[PDB]
Design an enzyme around this catalytic site. Structure first.
Site, PDB file in Angstrom:
ATOM      1  CG  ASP A 133      15.866  13.288  -6.775  1.00 57.51           C
ATOM      2  OD1 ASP A 133      16.681  12.898  -5.984  1.00 57.51           O
ATOM      3  OD2 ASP A 133      15.859  14.508  -7.231  1.00 57.51           O
ATOM      4  CG  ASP A 183      28.377   1.129   5.195  1.00 57.16           C
ATOM      5  OD1 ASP A 183      27.947   0.998   4.040  1.00 57.16           O
ATOM      6  OD2 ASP A 183      29.549   1.585   5.499  1.00 57.16           O
ATOM      7  CD  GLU A 191      34.515   0.148   1.697  1.00 57.17           C
ATOM      8  OE1 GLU A 191      34.450   1.002   0.842  1.00 57.17           O
ATOM      9  OE2 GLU A 191      33.445  -0.339   2.308  1.00 57.17           O
ATOM     10  CB  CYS A 238      24.406   3.760  -1.231  1.00 55.39           C
ATOM     11  SG  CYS A 238      25.765   4.914  -1.611  1.00 55.39           S
ATOM     12  CE1 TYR A 269      30.447   4.450  -6.246  1.00 56.82           C
ATOM     13  CE2 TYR A 269      28.403   5.077  -5.096  1.00 56.82           C
ATOM     14  CZ  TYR A 269      29.777   4.885  -5.106  1.00 56.82           C
ATOM     15  OH  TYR A 269      30.426   5.146  -3.915  1.00 56.82           O
ATOM     16  CG  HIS A 289      29.549  -1.938   4.096  1.00 56.41           C
ATOM     17  ND1 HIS A 289      30.773  -1.360   3.809  1.00 56.41           N
ATOM     18  CD2 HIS A 289      29.507  -2.264   5.408  1.00 56.41           C
ATOM     19  CE1 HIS A 289      31.452  -1.345   4.957  1.00 56.41           C
ATOM     20  NE2 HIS A 289      30.717  -1.886   5.955  1.00 56.41           N
ATOM     21  CD  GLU A 336      30.363   5.554   2.968  1.00 58.50           C
ATOM     22  OE1 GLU A 336      29.402   6.312   3.096  1.00 58.50           O
ATOM     23  OE2 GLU A 336      31.101   5.449   1.868  1.00 58.50           O
ATOM     24  CG  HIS A 396      19.464  14.740  -4.692  1.00 54.74           C
ATOM     25  ND1 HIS A 396      18.431  14.991  -5.588  1.00 54.74           N
ATOM     26  CD2 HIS A 396      20.259  15.839  -4.680  1.00 54.74           C
ATOM     27  CE1 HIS A 396      18.619  16.199  -6.114  1.00 54.74           C
ATOM     28  NE2 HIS A 396      19.715  16.741  -5.567  1.00 54.74           N
TER      29      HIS A 396
HETATM   30 MN   LIG Z   1      31.427   0.072   2.207  1.00 51.36          MN
END
Ligand SMILES: [Mn+2]
Ligand SMILES: [Mn+2]
EC number: 4.1.99.12
Lengths: 216, 216
Positions: free
Chosen positions: B88, B30, B26, B55, B83, B142, B163, B125
Site C-alpha cells: 500500500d 490483460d 493463459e 498487479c 509475485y 503479461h 486480466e 493491496h
Molecule cells: Mn497473465
C-alpha cells in the site's frame, strides 16, 4: 439494518450478507459469504461488485492445518489484516486461478472437511486471512466477522469476503470511471436491498455475541 | 490487431492497451498501462472491467531498489508469476489501501524516480510482479509485456496489469452472474474497440523486439 439472527439465517442458507465495520475504522461494507458452497456464478457477482481482491477468512486452526503461513513475518499493520500466502486450487479443472470458477473452487476447497496443504498451490489468486482467536469481540474487522458468521450459522470455518466499491460512472467510449470511491452507510444498505441480501453492522454482531459471552 | 509501434505510442500517451498472451498459455487478455501517471479514474475503470487483482510489473532492479522480496521463496509455479510481497502507499491520503484512489497512488509511487522502500507499507493491496531479466523473449507473460512496453515507450520501469474477465450476465434481483468466464480472442479485440484502446498480442510484441535483438 437487519437483526443478527436474520443475517445468520441468510448466511446459513449460503447467501451473501453485507457487513459494515465501524465508521471510525474502515467505514467499509464487505460482501461476506460461507466458502463451503460458493458457486461460480456467485463468485462472478462478487468480483463484479467488489474490489476484486477476494479473501478467505479462516481460523488459526485452519491456517495451521492447511499450512498457510502469514505473508509477512513483521506486519506493517499490527492490527493489520492477517494475510497468509495466497493460493490457487490444485485441481484438474483449474486453469490460471483467476476466473470466477477457479477462485470459487479455491474457496470451497479451503473449506472442505478433508482439506490438506497439498490441495493448494502457492502463491495464487485467493487470499486467506487469519482471524484472531478472540473473534469479533477482540478485533472488529471483516475477517473476524466472516469467521464469526460461519460459527454462528454452523458452517465450515472459512468465509469469503471482499469490499464493496463505488465504481463511479461509466464514460461512454473512454477508459475511465468518474467519481469512484467506496460504498458507504446508506448506500450499502441500498445495495443489499437491490440484491435481496441482508445487511448489518459488526457492532450489532458484537452485541449478538455478547448475549452469550459477555463484554470482552 | 494493432501494429506494435501504434500500441507503443498509445502506451506512451498514458493509455491502457489490451494485450493477449498465446492461446496455448493463459489465452488471456490483460489491460496494461504505465504506472507512473495512472489516474484514480483510470484505476476505477481497470477495477470495474478486470479481475480486480491489480498487479504492478517491474524490473529486478526495481525490486531490489524498493526492497520487494518474492512472496514465496519456492514458487508453486517455476515459470510462475513472480509475485513480491504486496504493498500500500505510505502517504497521508491513503485510507484502507483498496480504493481506486489508493491503488492508483501505490502504482504511481512504485514508479516514482525517487521511490524508496519506506514509501510502501507491507502487506497491502497492490501486487508487484518481478519481470525476468530476459524480457518478453525469455518469458512470454503479461508481466514481461508490461515492463517491455514501459521500456519501448520511454516510461518508468513499472506497469500495471490485470486480466479482463467476462463478468457474464446480470440476473435481476439476484446475487449471481450467469455464464461468467474470461474474455478471449475476438472478444478482447471488441472490448478494446469499444473503449478506444489499442490491442495486440505478446507474439507480435516479441516479433517487434526481435527486429532489434534477434531471436533469443
Ligand atoms: Mn497473465
Ligand atoms: Mn475490511
Amino acid at each position: 439494518f437487519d437483526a443478527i439472527p436474520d443475517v445468520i439465517q441468510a448466511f446459513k442458507n449460503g447467501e451473501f450478507v453485507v457487513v459494515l465495520d465501524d465508521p471510525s475504522r474502515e467505514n467499509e461494507a464487505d460482501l461476506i459469504i460461507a466458502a463451503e458452497s460458493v458457486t461460480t456464478e456467485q463468485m462472478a457477482f462478487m468480483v463484479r461488485h467488489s474490489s476484486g481482491l477476494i479473501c478467505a477468512p479462516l481460523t488459526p486452526e485452519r491456517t495451521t492445518a492447511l499450512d498457510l503461513p502469514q505473508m509477512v513475518t513483521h506486519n506493517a499493520d499490527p492490527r493489520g489484516t492477517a494475510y497468509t500466502v495466497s493460493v490457487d486450487a490444485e485441481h484438474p479443472s483449474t486453469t490460471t486461478g483467476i476466473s470466477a470458477h477457479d477462485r470459487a473452487l479455491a474457496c470451497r476447497m479451503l473449506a472442505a472437511p478433508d482439506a490438506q496443504p497439498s490441495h493448494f498451490r502457492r502463491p495464487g489468486h485467493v487470499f486467506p486471512l487469519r482471524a484472531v482467536a478472540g473473534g469479533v469481540r477482540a478485533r472488529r474487522g471483516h475477517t473476524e466477522a466472516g469467521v464469526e458468521l460461519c460459527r454462528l450459522a454452523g458452517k465450515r470455518p472459512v468465509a469469503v469476503i471482499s469490499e464493496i466499491v463505488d465504481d463511479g460512472q461509466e464514460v461512454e467510449g473512454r477508459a475511465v470511471r468518474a467519481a469512484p470511491g467506496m460504498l458507504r452507510g446508506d448506500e450499502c444498505v441500498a445495495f443489499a436491498r437491490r440484491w435481496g441480501l441482508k445487511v448489518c453492522t459488526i457492532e450489532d454482531m458484537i452485541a449478538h455475541v455478547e448475549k452469550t459471552e459477555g463484554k470482552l
